[PDB]
């Protein structure tokens, strides 16, 4: 069982958008909950992301696919984004991360 | 893709060679040291061709295929020989079923200190590999990565003690400690494998949620769940004989933990500075973090909420996992087994109540059912610690000796009784709040070892019943037995 996160690297300019697409694979178990985390540049702690405003989640339990789109991109956003998936058995895994860089 | 090459690159030559040695010794428990050395060197030399070129012949074969072929080559040249005639995956399964915990092997007779120290000096590599082999073959379910840490501890003991005034005074005692720690660790590793091996993950995962939650109370449920998943993977691979995969996965977990300390525990700094084997061992033995400041009662979410049954029905394991996490994080003073009995009680009540027209009225006082369950181990510890404090270790052991012999082989009864006397000596010296976790958790190990010993030669019935009935109810089953 594994979670595939794409893209692992991204660079956008100010005012643009980013869509991170995660897939729960190699399992016979259904997808239950999804979690998105932000690890700031030069941070030793990841804080969970409250999906609101700019943050828009799209879930498809059949494909076992879940994606997060960030509407307006700003410099402040430059951070590592991690997706976490939990199956109905509680098997919990993380995608390899997305290192987004926002430039002007 | 060459798995062997990937494992070699990640583990490094030295660790790869040690792990291959342990793996072979844990299966070919009867074969001489020299036989194993030959096998290891051959495997390592081949791995190196794969490292240089993943496209080299046979480099793309699975580890089980390659390992079985290497072992099997020797075997053709009793029952072990039968496994060799099978094909993968049946062959691996066959070898796994043939890891006999005790087909008896004569106890180790250690050379004299002067001889050992000289051998250590003349050839540290071979000397240390020899010991790795001796321990591994005698303990087939010994957690591989841990054996590597013990090896570095044995190396340190010889390094320090061989240049001391009295070689024996320095060395012999350390060796005795390592031997004892080793047997204990091996017993714990057999308990974990037995759960995975028969029942599967849910039993192990339950234990893990409870233990990790007591240890990392500040961590969120999702984090604990993630850690249980990773730990289950490591443990599963080690238990089935996937030593390299397990070792690398354990290293990766320790790394993940260290890079996410702020989301796990404030007590990990010291460990995360250590060397790679010493770090994982430290993390594994890390003391419980302090629990969050003002934690609310579980009543609101697990008893009062209208969504109890809805949340339970939708994903039972998730809900129960959350119950276990919330209860455990709040109770580092409880044994893991007690916490598991509380979760089982909660599960049974919900399964019954949620079927009713008005579930809430039915499960409204569930927490009351917990009180008698909590008190039983508590009182049992109090009475036994009080009896130990009045008798002393020896007399205490003898009282236990008579008590258990009266209920249900003498050598086994002596050994278990002696160890039980030690539980007393170890645990009763600890403050009341820490007594349950050390006592019940260590007793569950001693009783599992007794079960294993009965299992090889089943002459008794009462013991097998208690042993295979319920893992969480092993001690109460056994404890409650009559003359």
UniProtKB/Swiss-Prot annotation, chain B:
Primary localisation category: secreted
Binding positions (Ca(2+) 2): 10, 248, 252
Q: In which tissues is it expressed?
A: Plasma.
Phosphoserine-modified residues are: 2, 55, 62, 266, 409, 479
Protein name stated in the entry: Albumin
Record family assignment: Belongs to the ALB/AFP/VDB family.
Where in or outside the cell it occurs: the entry states:
Secreted
Q: Cite the GO molecular-function annotations of the record.
A: antioxidant activity; copper ion binding; DNA binding; enterobactin binding; exogenous protein binding; fatty acid binding; identical protein binding; protein-folding chaperone binding
The UniProt record lists the keyword DNA-binding: no
Modification type Phosphothreonine: residues: 410, 412
Summarize the subunit comment.
Interacts with FCGRT; this interaction regulates ALB homeostasis. Interacts with TASOR. In plasma, occurs in a covalently-linked complex with chromophore-bound alpha-1-microglobulin with molar ratio 1:2 and 1:1; this interaction does not prevent fatty acid binding to ALB.
An example Gene Ontology biological process: cellular response to starvation
Return the GO cellular component terms, semicolon-separated. blood microparticle; cytoplasm; endoplasmic reticulum; endoplasmic reticulum lumen; extracellular exosome; extracellular region; extracellular space; Golgi apparatus
Disulfide bridge map? 50-59, 72-84, 83-94, 117-162, 161-170, 193-239, 238-246, 258-272, 271-282, 309-354, 353-362, 385-428, 427-438, 451-467, 466-477
Source organism phylogeny: Eukaryota, Metazoa, Chordata, Craniata, Vertebrata
Outcome of swapping residue 64 to A:
Impairs metal binding
Upon changing residue 365 to E, the result is:
In Naskapi/Mersin/Komagome-1
**Task performed by this protein:** Binds water, Ca(2+), Na(+), K(+), fatty acids, hormones, bilirubin and drugs. Its main function is the regulation of the colloidal osmotic pressure of blood. Major zinc transporter in plasma, typically binds about 80% of all plasma zinc. Major calcium and magnesium transporter in plasma, binds approximately 45% of circulating calcium and magnesium in plasma. Potentially has more than two calcium-binding sites and might additionally bind calcium in a non-specific manner.
**Positions contributing to Ca(2+) 1 binding:** 3, 237, 242, 245
Disease tied to this entry: Hyperthyroxinemia, familial dysalbuminemic: A disorder characterized by abnormally elevated levels of total serum thyroxine (T4) in euthyroid patients. It is due to abnormal serum albumin that binds T4 with enhanced affinity. Analbuminemia: A rare autosomal recessive disorder manifested by the presence of a very low amount of circulating serum albumin. Affected individuals manifest mild edema, hypotension, fatigue, and, occasionally, lower body lipodystrophy (mainly in adult females). The most common biochemical finding is hyperlipidemia, with a significant increase in the total and LDL cholesterol concentrations, but normal concentrations of HDL cholesterol and triglycerides.
Changing residue 170 to F does what? In Hawkes bay
Modification N6-succinyllysine, positions: 198, 426
Carbohydrate-modified residues are 9, 48, 130, 155, 192, 218, 226, 269, 274, 306, 310-311, 316, 344, 371, 406, 429, 434
Residue positions binding Zn(2+)? 64, 240, 242
Record domain Albumin: where: 1-179, 180-372
């Amino acid at each position: 069982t594994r979670v595939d996160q794409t893209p692992r690297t991204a660079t956008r300019e100010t005012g643009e958008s980013l869509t991170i697409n995660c897939v729960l694979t190699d399992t016979s178990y259904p997808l239950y909950s999804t979690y998105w985390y932000r690890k700031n540049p030069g941070s030793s702690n990841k804080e969970q992301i409250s999906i609101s405003g700019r943050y828009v989640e799209s879930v498809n339990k059949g494909t076992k696919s879940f994606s997060l789109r960030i509407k307006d991109l700003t410099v402040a956003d430059s951070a590592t984004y991690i997706c976490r998936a939990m199956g109905t058995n509680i098997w919990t895994g993380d995608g390899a991360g997305t290192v987004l860089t926002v430039n002007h | 893709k060459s798995e062997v090459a990937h494992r070699f690159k990640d583990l490094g030559e030295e660790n790869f060679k040690a792990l291959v040695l342990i793996a072979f010794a844990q299966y070919l428990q009867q074969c001489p040291f020299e036989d194993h050395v030959k096998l290891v060197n051959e495997v390592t030399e081949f791995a190196k061709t794969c490292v240089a070129d993943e496209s080299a012949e046979n480099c793309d074969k699975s580890l089980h295929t390659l390992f079985g072929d290497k072992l099997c080559t020797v075997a053709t040249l009793g029952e072990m020989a039968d496994c060799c005639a099978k094909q993968e995956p049946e062959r691996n399964e066959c070898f796994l079923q043939h890891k006999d915990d005790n087909p008896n092997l004569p106890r180790l007779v250690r050379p004299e200190v002067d001889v050992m120290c000289t051998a250590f000096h003349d050839n540290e590599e071979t000397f240390l590999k020899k010991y790795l082999y001796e321990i591994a073959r005698r303990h087939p379910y010994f957690y591989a990565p841990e054996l590597l840490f013990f090896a570095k501890r044995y190396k340190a003991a010889f390094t320090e003690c061989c240049q001391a005034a009295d070689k024996a005074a320095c060395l012999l005692p350390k060796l005795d400690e390592l031997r004892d720690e080793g047997k204990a660790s091996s017993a714990k590793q057999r308990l974990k494998c037995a759960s995975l091996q028969k029942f599967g993950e849910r039993a192990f995962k339950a234990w893990a949620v409870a233990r990790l939650s007591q240890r990392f109370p500040k961590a969120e449920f999702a984090e604990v769940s993630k850690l249980v998943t990773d730990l289950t993977k490591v443990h599963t691979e080690c238990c089935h004989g996937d030593l390299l995969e397990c070792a690398d996965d354990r290293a990766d977990l320790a790394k993940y933990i260290c890079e996410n300390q702020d989301s796990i525990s404030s007590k990990l700094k010291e460990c995360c500075e250590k060397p790679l084997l010493e770090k994982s061992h430290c993390i594994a033995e890390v003391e419980n973090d302090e629990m969050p400041a003002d934690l609310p009662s579980l009543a609101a979410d697990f008893v009062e909420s209208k969504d109890v049954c809805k949340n339970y029905a939708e994903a039972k394991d998730v809900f129960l996992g959350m119950f276990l996490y919330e209860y455990a994080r709040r109770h580092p003073d409880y044994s893991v087994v007690l916490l598991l009995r509380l979760a089982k009680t909660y599960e049974t009540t919900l399964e019954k109540c949620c079927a009713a027209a008005d579930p809430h009225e039915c499960y409204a006082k569930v927490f009351d059912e917990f009180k008698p369950l909590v008190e039983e181990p508590q009182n049992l510890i109090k009475q036994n610690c009080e009896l130990f404090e009045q008798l002393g270790e020896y007399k205490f052991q003898n009282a236990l000796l008579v008590r258990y012999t009266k209920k249900v082989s003498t050598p086994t009864l002596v050994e278990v009784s002696r160890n039980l006397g030690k539980v007393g000596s170890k645990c009763c010296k600890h403050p009341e709040a820490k007594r349950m976790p050390c006592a019940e958790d260590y007793l569950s190990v001693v009783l599992n070892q007794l079960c294993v010993l009965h299992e090889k030669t089943p002459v008794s019935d009462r013991v097998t019943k208690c042993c295979t009935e319920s893992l969480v109810n092993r001690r109460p089953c056994f404890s409650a037995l009559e003359v």
